[PDB]
Design a protein around this nucleic acid. Sequence first.
RNA 1: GCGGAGUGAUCUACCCAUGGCCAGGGUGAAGCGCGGGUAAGACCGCGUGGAGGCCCGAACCCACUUAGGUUGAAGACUGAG
RNA 2: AGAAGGGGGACCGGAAUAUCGUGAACACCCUUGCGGUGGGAGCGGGAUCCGGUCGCAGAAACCAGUGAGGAGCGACUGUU
RNA 3: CAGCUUGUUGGUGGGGUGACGGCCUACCAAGGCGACGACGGGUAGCCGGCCUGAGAGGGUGUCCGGCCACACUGGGACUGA
RNA 4: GCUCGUAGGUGGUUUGUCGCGUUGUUCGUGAAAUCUCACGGCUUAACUGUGAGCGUGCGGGCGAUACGGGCAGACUAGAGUACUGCAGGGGAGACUGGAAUUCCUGGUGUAGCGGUGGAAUGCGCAGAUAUCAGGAGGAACACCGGUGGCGAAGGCGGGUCUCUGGGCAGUAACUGACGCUGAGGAGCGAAAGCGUGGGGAGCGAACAGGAUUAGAUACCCUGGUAGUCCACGCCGUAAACGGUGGGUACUAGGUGUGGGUUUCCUUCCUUGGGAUCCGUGCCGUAGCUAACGCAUUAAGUACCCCGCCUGGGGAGUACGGCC
RNA 5: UCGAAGGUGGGAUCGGCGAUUGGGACGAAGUCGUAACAAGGUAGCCGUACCGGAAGGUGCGGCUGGAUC
Lengths: 67, 87
Amino acid sequence: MQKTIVVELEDRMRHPLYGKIIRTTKKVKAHDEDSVAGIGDRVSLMETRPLSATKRWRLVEILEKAK
Amino acid sequence: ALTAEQKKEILRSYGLHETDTGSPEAQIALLTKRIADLTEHLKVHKHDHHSRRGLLLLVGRRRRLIKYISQIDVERYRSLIERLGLR
RNA sequence: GCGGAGUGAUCUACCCAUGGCCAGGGUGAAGCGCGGGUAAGACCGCGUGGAGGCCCGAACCCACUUAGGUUGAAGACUGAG
RNA sequence: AGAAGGGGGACCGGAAUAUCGUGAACACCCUUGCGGUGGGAGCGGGAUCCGGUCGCAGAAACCAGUGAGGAGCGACUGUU
RNA sequence: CAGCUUGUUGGUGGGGUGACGGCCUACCAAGGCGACGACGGGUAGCCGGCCUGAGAGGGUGUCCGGCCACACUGGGACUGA
RNA sequence: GCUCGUAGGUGGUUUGUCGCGUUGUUCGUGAAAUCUCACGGCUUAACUGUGAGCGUGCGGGCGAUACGGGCAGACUAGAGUACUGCAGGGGAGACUGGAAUUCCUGGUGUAGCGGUGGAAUGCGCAGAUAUCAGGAGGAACACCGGUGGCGAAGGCGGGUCUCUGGGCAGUAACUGACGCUGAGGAGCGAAAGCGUGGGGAGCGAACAGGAUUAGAUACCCUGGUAGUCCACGCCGUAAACGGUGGGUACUAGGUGUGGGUUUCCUUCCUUGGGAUCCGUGCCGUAGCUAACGCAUUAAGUACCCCGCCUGGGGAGUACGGCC
RNA sequence: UCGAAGGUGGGAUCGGCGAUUGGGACGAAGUCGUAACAAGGUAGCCGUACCGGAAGGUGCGGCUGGAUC
Ligand SMILES: [Mg+2]
Ligand SMILES: [Mg+2]
Ligand SMILES: [Mg+2]
Ligand SMILES: [Mg+2]
Ligand SMILES: [Mg+2]
Ligand SMILES: [Mg+2]
Ligand SMILES: [Mg+2]
Ligand SMILES: [Mg+2]
Ligand SMILES: [Mg+2]
Ligand SMILES: [Mg+2]
Ligand SMILES: [Mg+2]
Ligand SMILES: [Mg+2]
Ligand SMILES: [Mg+2]
Ligand SMILES: [Mg+2]
Ligand SMILES: [Mg+2]
Ligand SMILES: [Mg+2]
Ligand SMILES: [Mg+2]
Ligand SMILES: [Mg+2]
Ligand SMILES: [Mg+2]
Ligand SMILES: [Mg+2]
Ligand SMILES: [Mg+2]
Ligand SMILES: [Mg+2]
Ligand SMILES: [Mg+2]
Ligand SMILES: [Mg+2]
Ligand SMILES: [Mg+2]
Ligand SMILES: [Mg+2]
Ligand SMILES: [Mg+2]
Ligand SMILES: [Mg+2]
Ligand SMILES: [Mg+2]
Ligand SMILES: [Mg+2]
Ligand SMILES: [Mg+2]
Ligand SMILES: [Mg+2]
Ligand SMILES: [Mg+2]
Ligand SMILES: [Mg+2]
Ligand SMILES: [Mg+2]
Ligand SMILES: [Mg+2]
Ligand SMILES: [Mg+2]
Ligand SMILES: [Mg+2]
Ligand SMILES: [Mg+2]
Ligand SMILES: [Mg+2]
Ligand SMILES: [Mg+2]
Ligand SMILES: [Mg+2]
Ligand SMILES: [Mg+2]
Ligand SMILES: [Mg+2]
Ligand SMILES: [Mg+2]
Ligand SMILES: [Mg+2]
Ligand SMILES: [Mg+2]
Ligand SMILES: [Mg+2]
Ligand SMILES: [Mg+2]
Ligand SMILES: [Mg+2]
Ligand SMILES: [Mg+2]
Ligand SMILES: [Mg+2]
Ligand SMILES: [Mg+2]
Ligand SMILES: [Mg+2]
Ligand SMILES: [Mg+2]
Ligand SMILES: [Mg+2]
Ligand SMILES: [Mg+2]
Ligand SMILES: [Mg+2]
Ligand SMILES: [Mg+2]
Ligand SMILES: [Mg+2]
Ligand SMILES: [Mg+2]
Ligand SMILES: [Mg+2]
Ligand SMILES: [Mg+2]
Ligand SMILES: [Mg+2]
Ligand SMILES: [Mg+2]
Ligand SMILES: [Mg+2]
Ligand SMILES: [Mg+2]
Ligand SMILES: [Mg+2]
Ligand SMILES: [Mg+2]
Ligand SMILES: [Mg+2]
Ligand SMILES: [Mg+2]
Ligand SMILES: [Mg+2]
Ligand SMILES: [Mg+2]
């Protein structure tokens, strides 16, 4: 995507009524001025100003790069 | 089929240490051999549904095992795929 | 009109042997490759290929409509479709 | 199904000096041939975008599908 | 209601704004969203609250208070903090 | 109807770490009014003012690590593999056997046969039924055979050969949680039915005649086509039933039967008894149930996942869509 | 250039009416049979196919939510 990375975020939160812990996933889009990140590659992000129409995150560091 | 010695050539070629019979690689090799042989059986006898079900069960078991080896060591998974076949 | 004996397929009907002819455009079947899909398949998407009593349209072969001709240019044609 | 229904179409200049695509001369190797590689001249082809110009009209004359809907009969191409 | 999207998704240079930004433009890449319901259809101003209920819930948004939208219907700008 | 499996949900024992979930504390915020508790003021009350609650939450900091989760390991009890045995109508293909029914040919033979509650239609006298010999052809496989076996279910029994699936027990050799379930999806799926081709003995929807009957589009009788059979496809439904989804653990016994292993009594030849594992029945305690009943093969005690229900009709129907 | 309103065109979608026609429900003390409930007088139901004024009948397979020694 030419200097843009797409990262999937998962979060768990109690069900409002039944009380079960439900797991849900998001998909944010992050910025790479120097595009080096592949599939897998657990990463850390920090949310920023509207760098684009849909981008609000910037890549910080690629920790435990993919196997 | 797969007589004892017939399984022996496969176990020698794909096992790990001179006595390995239950490792994912050995099991996948044996399942692949059985699946192949049953496939030539089923090319004739198109209406042996009761044996085609056994083929399906073997395929499912091999798929679980391949998934497990992929989860545990991707390098072993890749080497085994190249040694046998995928897709 | 009836009978006998002959003459005719150089027109036309069908058949037989042997030759010849059909501008130019369009569409895109089987098959075959590639990729996808799967355990393998079915199946799907692209290419290639160039099928068909296929499409439009000259020569060619017909004869649907109309007008003219109707002591005709012509004992069956001409013009425009 | 070319369903139906719509839009563009001329000329001049520029992009455009390899703009792009065809063929490939002068000059570059070699198992020397009626040989190969680069090379790009001159000669032709086509399309687009931008700007301008003209007329009532840019398919220019000749040429060149009318289309849609509902029934009946025969399935269809053919034959008389 | 199962496929939606081509300024659409992203990048670069410009333009524009009080301000980041496809907000706009030229070029480049081919992405983006979707069964955790995209796209579509119906209905509706939202909330503090009000009514009920043992509570959890259900119904509701009227007085009062906060925010939003609009001013005959649709579009547009100007002046100005 | 049954299975396999995608996303998802859930997950055995054990070590370390993180501190996401969880939990403790503090700061900010959660406007006012309304609401609750206490006062205060209108002669009381409604109403009104004040104070504290409430505001279940969210954000920041600082603690905890039992459980959940992540990350890095370990283990063999679950799961799978290996070896050795074992039982089986599990499946597919090819060849093949005999009894019987029907028909054909011939011999003997003569007047009935057939059928019913009783008859008639019908067949026969042109030689039937009956009986003997030969032949053709199709379908189903007596005894074994059961309550018994195998299969996920539907289902599976004449024999032989070829190919092929699963199960159980023993060993503990191997891997090391690889498990369970499974929305959608895919596959299989009695019979009837459909397409193309073949075959057609018997049976037999439709159809015809007879009889019964008030009538008889039936039951009974005599015939009889599709079909039933085979090859290759489709269809996808059944009271597809245990009217009981799958997995796991636990909770008296008694008594049959199928498949193993096994000491001892080892001969008590007994192939008896005991023990253990896997099936399949009956009876019964606790427990459960409205009752009937179920009861270690749960409809009991619990946990994980899935499907389904929400009065009776209209209706598993219309419209839309998929096949 | 963009641009509301307007015009042209082919579709989508939500309703109303419609000769005629399909079933459904409810009505009285109408007509025709008697399918089910007892072995309901041929055990009944389930799937399917053909047939028949109508309940229904028959064939094939299934079940007991039926019997028999
Ligand atoms: Mg940028
Ligand atoms: Mg004459
Ligand atoms: Mg002659
Ligand atoms: Mg041509
Ligand atoms: Mg092709
Ligand atoms: Mg033609
Ligand atoms: Mg033509
Ligand atoms: Mg000529
Ligand atoms: Mg002619
Ligand atoms: Mg004339
Ligand atoms: Mg004249
Ligand atoms: Mg003419
Ligand atoms: Mg002419
Ligand atoms: Mg057209
Ligand atoms: Mg048309
Ligand atoms: Mg002008
Ligand atoms: Mg034309
Ligand atoms: Mg008609
Ligand atoms: Mg008429
Ligand atoms: Mg015709
Ligand atoms: Mg016809
Ligand atoms: Mg034609
Ligand atoms: Mg653009
Ligand atoms: Mg830009
Ligand atoms: Mg409104
Ligand atoms: Mg209550
Ligand atoms: Mg307005
Ligand atoms: Mg008004
Ligand atoms: Mg206005
Ligand atoms: Mg001012
Ligand atoms: Mg101003
Ligand atoms: Mg899973
Ligand atoms: Mg899991
Ligand atoms: Mg998990
Ligand atoms: Mg755990
Ligand atoms: Mg408050
Ligand atoms: Mg007082
Ligand atoms: Mg806190
Ligand atoms: Mg084990
Ligand atoms: Mg067969
Ligand atoms: Mg016969
Ligand atoms: Mg005789
Ligand atoms: Mg005889
Ligand atoms: Mg080990
Ligand atoms: Mg499963
Ligand atoms: Mg399902
Ligand atoms: Mg099938
Ligand atoms: Mg059948
Ligand atoms: Mg048939
Ligand atoms: Mg039929
Ligand atoms: Mg046939
Ligand atoms: Mg009969
Ligand atoms: Mg009969
Ligand atoms: Mg009759
Ligand atoms: Mg059903
Ligand atoms: Mg059954
Ligand atoms: Mg049921
Ligand atoms: Mg169970
Ligand atoms: Mg259970
Ligand atoms: Mg027992
Ligand atoms: Mg009760
Ligand atoms: Mg009992
Ligand atoms: Mg109960
Ligand atoms: Mg229906
Ligand atoms: Mg329909
Ligand atoms: Mg009407
Ligand atoms: Mg009856
Ligand atoms: Mg009755
Ligand atoms: Mg009766
Ligand atoms: Mg009866
Ligand atoms: Mg009948
Ligand atoms: Mg029936
Ligand atoms: Mg029956």
